[PDB]
Symmetry: D2
Subunit: 474 residues, 4 copies
């Protein structure tokens, strides 16, 4: 079989055992990745800790140059990498190539953002007259070794957004991609290998959850854990971290609040795009519509018609709706569809499943007593919940355990800003669908949606600490 290797301490290494990966859309084998042992994980960390001092000793300019080369290589092989990424996670080909390009953009931006690292000088005389000759020279420093873990829906992009910001500051990296998406993660590692970064500064890890899952997080060598995935695992990682710093991006149930003075055509278009992108397999996606009753009927018809125009099919054909990641996922989405349909909701598009390919579906008349009103599906299913007041919309929205982002469709901005202050989310989009949009902007979530503030600049601050040197002037 086409056997892939891990990049450890400047060497490509196979393990005694391996894991075979198949294509979610065809079932065809793509190749295999190593199934690491805890001893092999120990070697990755030892190598990283060994290389850190010399990496930190380099100038910012040299570290940025390395990252810039990685990005150039990725741009060169985007079609090559995109081809395999498309097949591994059943993502449309064009979209798969876009993820690689966006990974290059974030890597370049983090390189330049991080080389403009600066500290501050504080005055003792600001707080006390007797300490006026005392000043504090404060400079930023890396936290050490960072463990970065990416998700299946963006195995390459949501890896680079952790790796580049960590490396430019002087930290070393141990990268753990998702098993379903590990081949693409190893393809990303090749660019780092070709760029020539010193041995041990960048390493990869692959294996089975029951063998190295808790082990990679609990390890004393790890100084920071940056992760994107499920809420359950995220909660667990937070506890296993102890008092060590973390960054987590978990679930979402983004709501789109639609007022009576909204532009319904623009609203309909943005909701369709945000809700069905990648078959609904996104954390930042419109997952519930809270619309004022007086404009509900009209909005639902626009959305209904647009759903019927979506393409359904294979990754190679660039279909809007592709097969879901695995059988277990489709089974879950199916169970939510049954609950709503059996409880009274009105399905405005046909319920159909062939293999793991679920056709897009719009559900009207959804009530807070239904599972679909609160649970994150991660499938092509959108619920419409009608309200009679903006106050009610705010209550239902904040009632959720999630708080990633929110959309407000209205022509009254001062009012939209007021509502936005009340919503328990990280980001609020006015007259636009939710999105991580513009990686320079802050990205965070409230309640169970996460911990820590992302976005290039914020990721760098998060994965660095401070060093204060105090002395008296004579």
């Amino acid at each position: 079989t086409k056997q892939y290797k891990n990049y450890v301490n400047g060497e490509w290494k196979l393990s005694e055992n391996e894991i075979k990966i198949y294509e979610p859309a065809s079932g065809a084998e793509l190749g295999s990745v190593p199934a690491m042992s805890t001893e092999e994980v120990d070697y990755v960390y030892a190598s990283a800790k060994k290389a850190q001092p010399a990496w930190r000793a380099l100038s910012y300019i040299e570290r940025a140059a390395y990252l810039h080369k990685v990005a150039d290589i990725l741009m060169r092989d985007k079609e090559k990498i995109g081809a395999i990424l498309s097949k591994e996670v059943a993502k449309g080909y064009k979209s798969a190539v876009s993820e690689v390009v966006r990974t290059a953009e974030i890597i370049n931006y983090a390189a330049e953002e991080g080389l403009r690292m600066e500290g501050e000088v504080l005055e003792g005389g600001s707080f006390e007259a007797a300490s006026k000759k005392k000043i504090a020279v404060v400079r930023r420093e890396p936290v050490g070794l960072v463990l970065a873990i990416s998700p299946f829906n963006y195995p390459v992009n949501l890896a680079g957004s952790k790796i580049a910001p960590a490396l430019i500051a002087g930290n070393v990296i141990a990268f753990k991609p998702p098993t379903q998406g590990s081949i693409s993660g190893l393809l990303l590692a090749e660019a780092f290998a070709e760029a020539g970064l010193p041995a041990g500064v960048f390493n990869t890890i692959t294996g089975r959850g029951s063998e190295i899952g808790d082990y990679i997080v609990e390890h004393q060598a790890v100084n920071f854990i940056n992760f994107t995935g499920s809420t359950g695992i995220g909660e667990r990682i937070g506890k296993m971290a102890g008092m060590r710093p973390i960054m987590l991006e978990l679930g979402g149930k983004d709501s789109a609040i639609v007022l009576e003075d909204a532009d319904l055509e623009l609203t309909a278009k943005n909701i369709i795009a945000g809700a069905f992108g990648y078959s609904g397999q996104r954390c930042t996606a419109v997952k519930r519509v809270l619309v004022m009753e007086s404009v509900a009927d009209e909005l639902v018809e626009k959305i209904r018609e647009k759903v019927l125009a979506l393409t359904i099919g294979n990754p190679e054909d660039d279909a809007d709706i592709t097969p879901l990641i695995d059988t277990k996922s489709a089974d879950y989405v199916e169970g939510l569809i049954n609950d709503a349909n059996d409880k009274g909701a009105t399905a405005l598009t046909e319920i159909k499943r062939e293999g793991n390919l679920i056709c897009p579906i719009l559900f009207d008349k959804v009530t807070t007593d239904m599972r679909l009103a609160w649970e994150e599906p991660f499938g092509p299913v959108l619920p419409i919940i009608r309200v009679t007041s903006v106050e009610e919309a705010i209550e239902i929205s904040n009632k959720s355990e999630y708080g990633l982002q929110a959309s407000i469709f209205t022509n009254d901005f001062p009012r939209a800003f007021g509502i936005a202050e009340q919503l328990e989310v990280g980001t609020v989009h006015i007259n636009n669908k939710t999105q991580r949009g513009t990686d320079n902007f802050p990205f965070l979530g409230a309640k169970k949606s996460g911990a820590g503030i992302q976005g290039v600049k914020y990721s760098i601050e998060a994965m660095t600490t401070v060093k204060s040197v105090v002395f008296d002037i004579k």
Copy 2:
């Protein structure tokens, strides 16, 4: 006569000659102020330069405590000071007392804003690998001696907004109030004297323009000139400054852009307040209305009626419209009223003048061919100019030589933000009248309206320089 003295080097001093001040509303004598000689100005500067080093040597906390005491004293004597300020510049009594309270607020805020002064530490390795062991410790420093000159409409408030920000940073002060308003300026000086600031750090100057006007600005001892007054004088000061730093707040012809979807009642109320406050004797005041033709008639009627509700009379009665500062001013405003009325404009309120008291007047159908469409009157007269497109409104607005602030009345914010980017002004108020409002916000003007960015924080940065100390780590 009640003879006032200047505060110089910890002493109250009279001059051989004096200037008598009268009340603009009654003509009654208020007292007299010294008419300084150039030699006396030389002594003020010599004293200030002598005291600067020891003042700079104090801690930030000690300098803030002094300023806080000045503010407490002003609050104690607000009725006392307000009484005389009301009579000196013909400002309503209540309003006169408000200026003193606002002066105390700015003094306290500048004290606390300035004690939180901090520098930065820069990395050599950001720009060049070879310089990675080189860092730069950058701290703020005062510019030296600051010459502060206040205006007649706010002789105390627009003095403190220069003095406090300058003093907290470590600069010394030479304060020159307007001749008509010098008594109030000397009343402000008493608080500084009672607070006990060291001799020479704060001093006052009074005299005749033809004797010390250019002299006080051209003097080599002066390191910064902070001024508020007329555009002509401002231009002249900029030239006399040479290459020395300055801060100027000059004229204005603020426009209120009214779109077809605006709330006309709110628009009418804000325009009336902004245009007639203190009889129009303000730089930041609505001085021209650019309204879309379709809503013009309705807006003009609301404004017409509100003008008729304004009170007209004496300062002691807290009238909205009080007598103008002097005869020359009323004569000028009168000439602008004749030009417009003789050229065809439609006066919607009677033209009346008794002494230097001009009744408020609204002019409809004003064209760009009239003087009133461009010239700053500084009197109770408001011109209405009708337009047929937002593009035309933007052209007429930017056509002016002034660029202080602007108002936009509309319910479309994204569009308002777009228009705002096109307007050549410092500040744009959406659905509200222009104003220096909130002294923490930046205050500046484009084109002929000024030089430098004001507002507490920005005033401190402006009146300070930087000191960079570079060394290599071993």
Copy 3:
């Protein structure tokens, strides 16, 4: 007995059970504090969550005014409060009064630091051409309810440093002081009650660890846990926090690195002050001396003599060395003294204990094989460890599990900066003893010494989150 009450939802409340507090120096009863039940804790949290929205709705200026009043009241009653604080934790009277004054200073500073809260505006066109009309308006927001827990050595000061920074931002407070020091904590609460803050925004909690210890931390109502205490408890709190934000200040074993070119008299004086203050019961205190062999003998003699000049006795007499907090503590310190003495170290001052009062002791010839070389004693005992190179000093220092602060005594600054970059600590003092010194400066620790960056400004950033509003310009 003199029975104290908790301040809950604007009311003073007793519990069914109580805890009697005695004076560590005399054994005399001071009074009693409530022993809360889990239901009573539920009421405190419910009240706080209920009052938060209206508290957040107030302007920054109003919240600062409240805090300023609290500080003024504390200053008024400093002797009154200091008298009892001195007796409760066996701290010298004058020093006890100083803690109250410093608490007032931090409360006032946090009020003014927090009202100058500002956000940022980011450009979409910085990252992508297609997003140039998109901007992000980012403003700070409170995290919700903050649980503040203070230590016994600074029950009032290290309470206010958490409370004020939390309150000014818009968060509500639940304050849990140490049981031994709960009376002083309740005396601090009286100032908050007299200042008139709304019911529910500030509340206190007192009780037994085995009844409400884990309960107060695990509670879902709590959004942030700010704590100062032991490393063991700190680790536990971090785990119980889950993925919720925290702030921890734990143990320390600060080292004083002394080079051959150091000024030995200044070094000796600073080491004596830092090591014996409050009988060694401080986290930021010189706890081990790593001196170059060639200057060791001379330094040890200076330190020896200075130890003999320290006063020993009762709190009311302002003695340098007062009785330790409790019997268990003295027993522990005693065990460390025996280990070192039995293993070969050279005691240069007599070993004596009467009650819980341990006389100050200096130990020379300490080796890394002794407990005293690594364990935090929290008693008047100082170990001297000789080295032969700066490289050895750095290895021994970083070998510790703690990393709060460090001192370097030398006349070569460029070299001191280089060493400082290698030390695994938060703050490095050059030619001065360690200290939290100047509460505006950052205060943090590495490894097991803590989590999060303190200092007024940093405490405010830590206990706040961000809210991003994104929209497109037209």
Copy 4:
């Protein structure tokens, strides 16, 4: 003759008249440049003002890409450009090639520094309770058209340090290089032409001072004047600017303060390098040594010997000492040498001049009564002034009208920081020669040495203004 053209509005243009340029070292003709008329200057400005709006409308990312291409082209042709620059200003070949490379570094750095432009959001409730619902969205904006004028000693480097920072922010450029160095300036223009920037955004100007000198500065189309040259011209430009913003880097007389505990070998080496680089034709260069008497004799001998090792000759041979820019310059330097020698100073190296090539000379026993002690020579001549106290050194130093930078050679840093606070300069180098070193660091001068703060980041802030949009939340 090899006739060069100006780049105007996307076209290369000749003028009716021209100016022939010769090589300062050989007298051989290099070619010719246009001698523009005032009408031709009018066309450059009209074209620039016409192109500005569309340039400002592009995204930051697009403007940075353009600048990055300019830098890549310069790197490609460095030998080509360096060859001619070496001959035009008589600069060593290798050094001439270094200037081009450094120009590329600054252009790339300014591109990335400028795309990370961000504003701030301010709270109304910080200053007043009644204004809590009012916020200010503040974003940066370009000033318009920038006139950049470079010097002869760095015609290309000190052009790019103005151009790149101006262009990335959205301003348009009109570049005026020195006549002696205009060919190299036009070679720099070719890179901008090849990079394909829109017509009118970048333009060049060449001509005679008596024809377009005041004209280019006084022109109303110009919004900012950025200049590097002589103090006399700089003063004049400041006055001609009126109240428009400026940036000036003028003369210098940098002093090297040498204390008794200094490392004399390191001191000697740094002084030689700083004083004789490019034959002393630098603003930031050690121009006077203020050494404590007790170590003077030893330092002077080291310096004496090192001067004798300097190479003297032609640009093509990479000599340390090359011929001076013109005859008038050599004549001036000669006059300073005579004054000192005739007044009693001790010349420790021979006085020799052949053509415009003056051999390097060291003058000991210089007194404040000699011209060489205060006047900027711009030639290979270094004066040694002995002092008896640090206080005296500080007085003599600050006595100068110049205040660019300063060096302090000592092993006592706390003391060096104290002295640095007293020195009236922009930058102070501890144990190193003066230099613009690291273009990310701030670069400014006190007194007659300039106006405005340079350095990449500071240059961008200087050539931009602010736009404040204020509105109320509902």
